[PDB]
Design a binder for this molecule. Structure first.
Ligand SMILES: Nc1ncnc2c1ncn2[C@@H]1O[C@H](COP(=O)(O)OP(=O)(O)OP(O)(O)=S)[C@@H](O)[C@H]1O
Ligand SMILES: Nc1ncnc2c1ncn2[C@@H]1O[C@H](COP(=O)(O)OP(=O)(O)OP(O)(O)=S)[C@@H](O)[C@H]1O
Ligand SMILES: Nc1ncnc2c1ncn2[C@@H]1O[C@H](COP(=O)(O)OP(=O)(O)O)[C@@H](O)[C@H]1O
Ligand SMILES: Nc1ncnc2c1ncn2[C@@H]1O[C@H](COP(=O)(O)OP(=O)(O)O)[C@@H](O)[C@H]1O
Ligand SMILES: [Mg+2]
Ligand SMILES: [Mg+2]
Lengths: 643, 339, 174, 328, 348
């Protein structure tokens, strides 16, 4: 067809703007002529190392240093000296209990350290002592019930007990839930029937092939009983049903929660559910005993890993393992497996360290874990390279690659370790000359204030590699943060960009590198003058020291500048307080915390100080006097003080 | 599924008595007929005739002629009795997930030919819309089938394609077509179609098109039908693009008058002509480097219109942003005019 | 997902050192008998930022397309904006000379390069440029700021002009 | 059950829309030939573009076929252009038989009314252009944008583009009088004038505020107070007090005034709008005018980024404070 | 069962102040086809009590029953999220902001299922189910666009009250179709009146001097006034006119922080103040609240020319703070820049 698409604009006569002419002013009539003459690039050749580190000289013999390390088996004396070093490092650890067990376990391999040093006994588990005692007592009660039923069977031919048939184990990943279940079942003679998400677990199939496990005896009550058949469909031994990652549910896993509801409903044998998410406790309906595994103490698992490496003829400092565990967020299986890799590779760095509290120490698994040995020379140390001045182009590209590696994890390496890296003294918390003191303090202050201006610019006006607050809000929030990973096989089909990630990581690396180089150089230049100030008799170094925490000082380097134990305890306190039934319908959460929470802390401390005065006991009857069902542990926690 | 029905119906489709799509009139047929990017086409001919065709990534702004080029190459490599047996054509029209890559692509690249023996070819138009996992399987199906079948990747945005996928193919950029080579084409179209057009008409036609002959033919087609004559005014009115006289008066108002007068004049002209402040920003920036200013004026002014172009993106009030645009000139240039 | 890491040992690989890339490229051109210049070596490595899969790919492309290795051939086949042009851009920034820098930026624009590879090349050229560290820090933060503008969607010549202007005014303003 | 007045009182036919003459002429000519082109309506919002296209579709088709043959969509989708393109493909692919009992058969092409045509990127708009050329004969579109300038050139070359200038205040004052007399509500003419001047030439927002005001009052007199605070329009003596605090020389009364504005619930955006409207038409120096207006612009950016109203207002008042007190 | 909820008004006529717009809301619910409402005002001004009063006026007293239900939804990026929502047989309650960049997701499906609930549950009371979205200022742009698509798809199926504190982050199309309700903060005398009312309802009698002092110290936040009054009750069984009205403990910890700010300007002082702000953020105080408090504290010692400069650098740095993700860097940048300015200022 091709009709005419006429421009219909309502041109009325007048308005002094419809028909316009170019202005007659001289500035806008002076249009400079445009020139496209570029410099010719065929004449100019690119030199060697012009845009990179192509140096004519090349290093030979520094790299390719093969280890070929033969670990001589430690004698009794040096091993006992290392045991006493571990004991002096960790005085609260019962060392003499766990080392003969490791020696028995160790006594051409084809099998991992996780199953080599797999705990056979529940007492051999590390951390979560209350939880393992509760689980062991529950299984002792259940095996006693099974034994009593057997005695009743041979003799023939429950509100007081509250022996609930099912227990939910919850905790973080790799803390040893499956290991503790295996250990206690092996010790008490239980036969575990394992149900995993890796196998087919549909309701009809699991019911038709697992109901008679709890509705009957066992055909082989003697002999080969402590083996664990993974259930799938492609002394007398009591049955024990185990359900690993009940939280992982697929569309193929149809009617699984109803199925397990029927199992717990009709069972006569103990059933154990284990998972990692905290949310499974609320969405699942039923009667079940709950067991929580907290994150184990860092020093205990550090001593345990150090005994493990001692058994394999390696001596290693505690602080390196503390850094490794905090990097893994105290994950036992991660640290054990990476230790197995790093040990069987021959160790990282051979450096002698004479400590009494002998073979050479093997510190340096922390920087090997982060891949920093792929960047630096084996002679180079991390903090040693950090402290000196960076001028060489190759050294500065290695520092760029270092920051690029830490910014892929969205971790500010330079700022989380700013006190340990700045050219100023750092210590653990327990007149014209004065004008020069204040002036040097002012130059250092201007340098650091400029640095915080820069890193504020890198937070806001540089993008991040991974988009923060993608599924929750910013950190330190009591709303949610229980963002469980996906459960479906359908792909994301998203339209994200990847160029603005690989480029952005280098962008923030370069910006952070140049800003820290500038501020460190400025602080060093200001501190060069401090010799004259010391000669003048005044020492402003008390104004220049940095007061850091003891927990942060125990590590070689920190990935965070904050306390997460405090964050976890506050967040648990607030979540438990606003879980109260009276305050369960409050809508405005920021108003909720910021208004009710300080006032409720005032009421808690007022009640505490009233009880401190030997006054009437009815002062204890305020919260229950207005039906505030707030538990006494939380009341005591909020009545301590405001930190 | 399908959508090749509409293309095959569309190729011999016209009223042929009244409709006049002159954009569809002038189509090159082969590489000797595509009179542009001659180094690229001769390189393709060299790689074809040596049986040394590598994997290809044809990328550029749309309309520069990638699809017709690779269609000509496909018809050159293989005759019409075996074209479907050796070349697979796909695009983002049939998007069902990553099942395309492991479905027709993986099955097609895993087999020999049917009738005659030779190397095969797959063209993937608009491959920028393939997801990251789809491309990440596509790299594997290239790696383990490279000796049998060559791959052609038609794209528009180079950066989004994952680095290994660009790594396994060579790349060809279809850049903008230079005005000195595009004036004879439009002159030929004008003399063949008896069109009256002045030098500002040619300048506006080549400036708005930004090195694309399809878009130029579209503009001249629309202007010729709407007015019967083609000039700078007729093209810009038919395009609804900023007239240079209008934005010149806008610049004159900021550079001569005071704040309130220039403000209300520019507001009335935006209401009168239907202009959004993004295009005023673009055209005044086009005027800034042409009009003579000192260097300090240039850096200050460029930074301020850059920040205004930022602030216009989030969706704030355009009124205050116009006010700040006038303020940018009022701070420096009019103070120096007072000086 | 996290438990897959937690049941494994994870190891890290880095972008490769340029000396190592240079050794492997001289090795492969020795095993292939490739005529070359050093110009081609810095070009072929600059096109492969630590990823020598690109190095061998564009090496094969240069040898198949021209048969000799020099910078001009590499930039004809890889089709990047020229390193010398963007080095000239940041050199004009050091001199705070807006005119020429904008002129050849407009030249790259009508040459047809995208906003993203221009800003990336600007990054990787003012990275290793020989000039003062504080002004280098300012330049890096500014080009990152403009790169966020392109990344958020707005990618125009006005954005690069304001980029260049703030770069140039960094020199004159102390 | 009931409908808002904006579609209840929009004209049924073209020729019933007022204040537009060439637009009515060309749309009527295109309706006479029963081949409406692809339309591109540009102008300020509330000018009646949607009303004109609904009237044209009601005239060309049957009222029972009108809703069948139109699909009203918007184009700033947060899920991308692929979703709305799939909906367009679904609507064009799906065909329902249609006829009129009035004696004239309907044209075969359908109508997809896609608003906010000035809000997309060039890539999404080019994808819409490919969708346009996919369905050139079987569906003719009407793109409604605030500004025709943001339209990329392949669309503007194949669409009949129509300017919709804002209506002079007398004619929509008469229209609002018609609405008031047909909706049995007691309003003074001063109230209608104030509603017009806070509507700022937006008839659609004016009648929306009118219906909302008559359902707030429940038949009472529509005062100037209710229409002052139904549009969020700040009282002017608050603006005068802000300027007096800036002229005064004390930051304490400055923050006291800002506290008075924020605890009243008055938003910072509307305050910036009226502060700008005062500053642009004042006797202030163009240096001060420029500094204050660029401060206003960046404050608008800051508040759009999620910053506090209070902080941005304190900093804005500090800048206006310093600019006024420099000359004093 | 504190004073704010036990003595909360239940119907529109039980409101004590701002009677006029309460009567206008009564007219709105009398008309019976109200469109979507946006309601706004400062915190503690009485927005939520007005919302639940017009809810109770709207339906029967089945609004007054409330439970909690939990919703598990897969993301478009295929990562399911679990959220807690307050629910009733007639209304729903969602605060979407806990989903962060997934606020958009929390926009559709629940409301879609509420639409489905409107297609499922029939009671012949009214032709829509209402849902309160809380803190809609923290909704992102794409979330607000998804809300606009939801409302222009389900206008005949469900309704929504939009509780916020500022309509600045509300995009103008959302402001265009929802009726604005400005809820100003109560005056001092109104706070004293309702405070004496709730004390007589508690059987307690206090002097009016305590009421006026408490009203001034609450700064027109009625919820804070009632909570604090209850704190004064816990402090003393009888009410005396010179009873020490207690101070908010994080507020006074912030005050001692500001004392450390103005006292000494040393890098050790910067680091210990950084640790104090760490303690505050582990106490989950919002960063803008911390900032407003600390600037209002430090401005009392600032001189006239310093006050304005502190104002624009505070606004600029908090603009970056909302632009930024981790507020620590921006807060420390502000405090160090104020160190620089203040040290530069007493030295001359
Ligand atoms: N507390 C511990 N004491 C001793 N060994 C442990 C401990 N925690 C973990 N391990 C070791 O790490 C291995 C893995 O532990 P698992 O029990 O499989 O982890 P988990 O607690 O089940 O958490 P999941 O299954 O990854 S969510 C065990 O087999 C042990 O070798
Ligand atoms: N250099 C050229 N000379 C002449 N016509 C050209 C040229 N480039 C493109 N065309 C025209 O463009 C039509 C199709 O070109 P395409 O290959 O579709 O363009 P493209 O670069 O692939 O980008 P698309 O297809 O628009 S996304 C041809 O039929 C020609 O009419
Ligand atoms: N010229 C006019 N004649 C009659 N009514 C009009 C006119 N202009 C606007 N209106 C009224 O104002 C409303 C504008 O709505 P709409 O068509 O959406 O405007 P726009 O499309 O410009 O946003 C219509 O409902 C109509 O009743
Ligand atoms: N008329 C009134 N009578 C008694 N208390 C009121 C009245 N108006 C408001 N309040 C109190 O003020 C507080 C304000 O809280 P809320 O209803 O959430 O409004 P906002 O959202 O403004 O904080 C409520 O706790 C309520 O108890
Ligand atoms: Mg396990
Ligand atoms: Mg193409």
């Amino acid at each position: 067809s091709f009709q005419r698409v006429v421009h219909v604009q309502q041109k009325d006569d007048g308005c002094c703007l419809w028909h316009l002419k170019p202005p007659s002013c001289p500035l806008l009539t002076k249009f400079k002529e445009l020139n496209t003459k570029v410099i010719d690039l065929s004449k100019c050749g690119i030199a060697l190392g012009e845009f990179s580190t192509l140096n004519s000289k090349l290093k030979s013999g520094n790299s390719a240093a093969v280890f070929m390390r033969t670990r001589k088996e430690f004698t009794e004396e040096v091993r006992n000296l290392l045991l006493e070093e571990i004991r002096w490092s960790n005085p609260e650890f019962s060392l003499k209990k766990y080392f003969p067990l490791l020696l028995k376990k160790q006594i051409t391999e084809d099998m991992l350290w996780t199953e080599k040093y797999q705990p056979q006994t529940a007492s051999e588990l590390i951390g979560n002592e209350l939880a393992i005692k509760k689980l062991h007592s529950w299984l002792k009660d259940w095996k006693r019930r099974a034994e009593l039923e057997e005695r009743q069977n041979l003799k023939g031919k429950e509100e007081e007990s509250r022996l609930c048939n099912t227990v939910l184990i919850t905790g973080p990943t790799g803390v040893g839930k499956t290991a503790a279940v295996y250990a206690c079942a092996q010790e008490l003679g239980f036969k575990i029937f394992e149900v995993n998400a890796s196998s087919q677990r549909s309701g009809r199939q699991i019911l038709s092939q697992l109901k008679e496990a709890t509705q009957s005896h066992q055909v082989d009550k003697q002999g080969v009983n402590s083996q664990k058949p993974c259930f799938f469909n492609s002394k007398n031994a009591t049955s024990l049903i185990l359900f690993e990652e009940v939280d992982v549910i697929f569309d193929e896993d149809a009617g699984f929660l109803n199925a397990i509801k029927t199992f717990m409903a009709t069972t006569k044998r103990p059933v154990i559910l284990t998972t990692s998410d905290p949310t499974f406790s609320l969405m699942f309906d039923g009667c079940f005993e709950e067991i929580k595994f907290s994150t184990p103490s860092l020093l205990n698992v550090a001593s345990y890993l150090q005994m493990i490496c001692l058994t394999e003829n390696f001596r290693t400092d505690v602080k390196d393992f503390v850094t490794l565990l905090t990097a893994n967020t105290c994950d036992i299986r991660k640290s054990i497996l990476y230790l197995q890799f790093w040990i069987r590779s021959g160790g990282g760095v051979l450096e002698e360290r004479p400590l009494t509290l002998l073979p050479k120490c093997d510190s340096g698994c922390a920087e090997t874990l982060f891949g920093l040995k792929n960047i630096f020379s084996p002679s180079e140390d991390l903090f040693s390279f950090l402290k000196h001045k960076i001028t060489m182009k190759e050294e500065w590209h290695k520092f760029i690659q270092l920051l690029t590696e830490f910014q892929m994890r969205n971790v500010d390496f330079l700022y989380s370790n700013l006190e340990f890296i700045l050219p100023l003294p750092v210590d653990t918390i327990p007149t014209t000359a004065g004008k020069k003191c204040s002036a040097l303090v002012s130059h250092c202050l201007n340098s650091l204030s400029e640095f915080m201006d820069n890193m504020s610019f890198l937070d806001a006006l540089l993008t991040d590699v991974r988009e923060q607050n993608k599924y929750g809000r910013n950190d330190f929030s009591w709303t949610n943060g229980k963002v469980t990973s996906g459960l479906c096989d359908e792909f994301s089909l998203e339209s994200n960009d990847g160029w603005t990630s690989q480029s952005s990581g280098e962008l923030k690396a370069a910006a952070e590198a140049l800003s820290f180089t500038k501020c460190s150089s400025a602080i060093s230049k200001a501190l060069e003058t401090l010799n004259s100030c010391k000669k003048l008799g005044r020492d402003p170094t008390n104004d220049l020291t940095f007061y850091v925490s003891q927990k942060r000082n125990n590590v070689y380097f920190s990935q965070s500048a904050a306390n997460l134990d405090n964050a976890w305890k506050r967040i648990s306190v607030i979540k438990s307080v606003f879980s109260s039934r009276s305050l369960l319908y409050v809508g405005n959460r920021q108003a909720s915390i910021i208004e009710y929470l300080p006032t409720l802390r005032n009421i808690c401390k007022t009640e505490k100080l009233k009880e401190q005065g030997k006054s009437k006991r009815r002062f204890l009857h305020y919260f229950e006097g207005i039906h505030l069902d707030i538990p006494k542990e939380t009341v005591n926690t909020l009545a301590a003080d405001f930190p | 599924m399908e959508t090749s029905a509409l293309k095959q119906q569309e190729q011999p489709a016209a009223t042929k008595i009244r409709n006049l799509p002159w954009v569809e009139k002038y189509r090159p047929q082969t590489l000797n007929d595509l009179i542009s990017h001659q180094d690229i086409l001769s390189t393709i001919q060299k790689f074809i005739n040596e049986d040394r065709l590598p994997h290809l990534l044809l990328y550029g702004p749309p309309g520069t002629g990638k699809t017709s080029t690779i269609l000509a190459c496909a018809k050159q490599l293989y005759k019409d009795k075996e074209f479907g047996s050796m070349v697979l054509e796909l695009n983002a029209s049939d998007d069902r997930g990553i099942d395309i890559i492991r479905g027709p692509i993986l099955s097609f690249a895993s087999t020999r030919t049917i009738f005659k023996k030779g190397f095969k070819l797959v063209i993937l138009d608009e491959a920028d819309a393939m997801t990251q996992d789809a491309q990440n399987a596509l790299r594997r199906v290239i790696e383990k089938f490279t000796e049998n079948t060559r791959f052609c990747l038609i794209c528009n945005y180079l950066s989004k394609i994952i680095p290994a996928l660009q790594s396994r193919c060579t790349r060809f950029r279809f850049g903008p077509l230079t005005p000195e080579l595009m004036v004879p084409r439009l002159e030929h179209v004008v003399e063949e179609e008896k069109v009256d057009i002045s030098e500002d008409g040619m300048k506006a036609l080549v400036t708005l098109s930004s090195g694309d002959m399809r878009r130029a033919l579209n503009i001249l087609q629309s202007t010729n039908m709407a007015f019967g004559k083609v000039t700078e005014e007729t093209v810009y009115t038919c395009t609804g693009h900023p007239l240079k006289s209008d934005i010149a008066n806008i610049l004159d108002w900021m550079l001569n008058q005071d704040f309130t007068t220039a403000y209300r004049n520019i507001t009335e002209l935006k209401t009168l002509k239907g202009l959004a402040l993004h295009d005023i920003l673009t055209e005044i920036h086009l005027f800034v480097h042409r009009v003579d200013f000192p260097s300090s004026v240039r850096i200050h002014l460029l930074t301020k219109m850059a920040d205004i172009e930022y602030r216009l993106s989030v969706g704030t009030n355009e009124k205050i942003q116009l006010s700040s645009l006038i303020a940018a000139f009022q701070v420096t240039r009019d103070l120096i005019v007072a000086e | 997902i996290e438990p897959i890491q937690s049941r494994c040992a994870v190891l890290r690989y880095t972008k490769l050192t340029d000396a190592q890339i240079l050794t492997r490229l001289m090795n492969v051109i020795e095993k292939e008998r490739v005529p070359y210049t050093d110009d081609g070596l810095e070009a072929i490595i600059f096109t492969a930022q630590g990823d020598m899969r690109q190095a061998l790919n564009n090496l094969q492309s240069t040898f198949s397309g021209f048969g000799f290795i020099n910078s001009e051939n590499v930039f004809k086949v890889c089709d990047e904006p020229h390193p010398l042009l963007v080095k000239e851009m940041i050199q004009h920034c050091v001199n705070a000379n807006i005119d020429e820098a904008y002129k050849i930026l407009a030249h790259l624009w009508h040459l047809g390069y995208s906003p993203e590879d221009i800003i990336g090349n600007i990054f990787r050229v003012c990275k290793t440029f020989q000039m003062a560290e504080y002004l280098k820090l300012e330049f890096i933060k500014e080009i990152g700021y403009t790169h966020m503008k392109i990344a958020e969607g707005v990618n125009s010549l006005l954005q690069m002009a304001g980029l260049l202007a703030r770069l140039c005014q960094k020199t004159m303003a102390p | 059950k009931p409908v808002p007045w904006v579609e209840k009182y929009r004209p049924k036919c073209v020729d019933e829309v007022a204040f537009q003459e060439e637009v009515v002429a060309v749309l009527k000519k295109s309706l006479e030939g029963a081949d409406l082109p692809n339309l591109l309506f540009y102008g300020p919002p509330g000018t009646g573009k949607t009303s004109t296209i609904l009237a044209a579709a009601r005239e060309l088709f049957g009222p029972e076929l009108f809703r069948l043959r139109v699909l009203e969509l918007n184009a700033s989708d947060e899920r991308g252009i692929q979703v709305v393109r799939e909906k367009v493909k679904n609507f064009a692919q799906l065909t329902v038989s249609g006829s009129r009992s009035d004696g004239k058969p309907c044209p075969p092409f359908k109508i997809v009314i896609l608003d906010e045509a000035d809000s997309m990127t060039s890539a999404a708009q080019a994808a819409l252009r490919r969708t346009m050329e996919k369905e050139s004969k079987t569906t003719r579109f009407c793109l409604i944008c605030n500004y025709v300038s943001r339209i990329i050139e392949p669309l503007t070359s194949r669409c009949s583009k129509f300017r919709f200038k804002p209506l002079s205040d007398k004619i929509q004052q008469q229209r609002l009088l018609d609405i008031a007399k047909k909706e049995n509500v007691k309003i003074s003419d001063e109230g209608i004038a104030y509603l017009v001047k806070v509507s700022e030439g937006d008839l659609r927002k004016a009648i929306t505020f009118l219906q909302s005001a008559t359902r707030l009052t429940g038949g009472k007199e529509i005062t100037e107070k209710v229409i002052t605070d139904i549009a969020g329009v700040i009282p002017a003596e608050k603006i005068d007090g802000v300027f007096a605090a800036c002229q005064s020389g004390s930051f304490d009364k400055l923050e006291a005034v800002v506290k008075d504005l924020i605890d009243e619930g008055h938003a910072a955006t509307q305050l910036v709008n009226q502060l700008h409207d005062v500053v642009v038409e004042n006797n202030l120096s163009d240096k001060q005018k420029s500094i204050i207006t660029e401060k206003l612009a960046e404050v608008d950016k800051c508040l759009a980024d999620g910053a506090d109203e209070h902080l941005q207002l304190i900093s804005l008042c500090a800048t206006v404070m310093q600019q006024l007190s420099q000359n004093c | 069962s504190l004073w704010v909820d036990k003595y909360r008004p239940c119907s529109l006529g039980r409101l004590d102040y701002h009677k006029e717009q309460a009567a206008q809301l009564r007219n709105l619910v009398q008309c019976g086809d109200f469109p979507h409402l946006l309601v706004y005002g400062p915190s503690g001004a009485g927005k939520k009590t007005r919302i639940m009063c017009i809810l109770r006026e709207l339906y029967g007293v089945g609004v007054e029953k409330l439970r909690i239900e939990h919703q598990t939804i897969t993301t478009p990026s295929k990562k399911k999220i679990e959220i807690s929502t307050i629910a009733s047989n007639y209304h729903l309650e969602v605060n979407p902001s806990d989903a962060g960049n997934s606020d958009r997701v929390v926009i559709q499906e629940m409301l879609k299922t509420v639409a489905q609930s409107q297609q499922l549950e029939t009671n012949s009371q009214r032709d829509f189910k209402v849902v309160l979205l809380t803190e809609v200022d923290k909704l992102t742009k794409d979330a607000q666009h998804a809300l606009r698509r939801t409302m222009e798809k389900y206008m005949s199926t469900c309704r929504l009250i939009l509780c916020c504190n500022s309509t600045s982050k509300v995009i103008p199309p959302i402001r265009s179709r929802c009726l604005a309700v400005r809820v100003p903060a109560p005056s001092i005398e109104d706070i004293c009146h309702v405070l004496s009312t709730v004390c007589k309802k508690e059987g307690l009698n206090l002097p009016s001097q305590l009421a006026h002092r408490l009203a001034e110290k609450s700064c027109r936040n009625l919820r804070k006034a009632l909570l604090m009054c209850e704190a004064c009750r816990v402090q003393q069984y009888p009410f005396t006119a010179d009873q020490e009205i207690p101070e908010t403990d994080w507020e006074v910890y912030l005050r001692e922080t500001a004392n450390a700010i103005v006292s000494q300007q040393t890098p050790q002082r910067l680091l210990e103040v950084r640790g104090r702000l760490y303690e505050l953020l582990t106490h989950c105080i919002p960063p803008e609240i911390i900032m407003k408090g600390l600037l209002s504290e430090l401005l009392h010692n600032c001189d006239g020319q310093l006050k304005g400069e502190v104002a624009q650098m505070a606004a600029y740095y908090e603009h970056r703070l909302q632009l930024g993700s981790k507020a620590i860097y921006h807060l420390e940048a502000f405090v160090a820049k104020f160190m620089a300015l203040y040290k530069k200022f007493m030295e001359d």
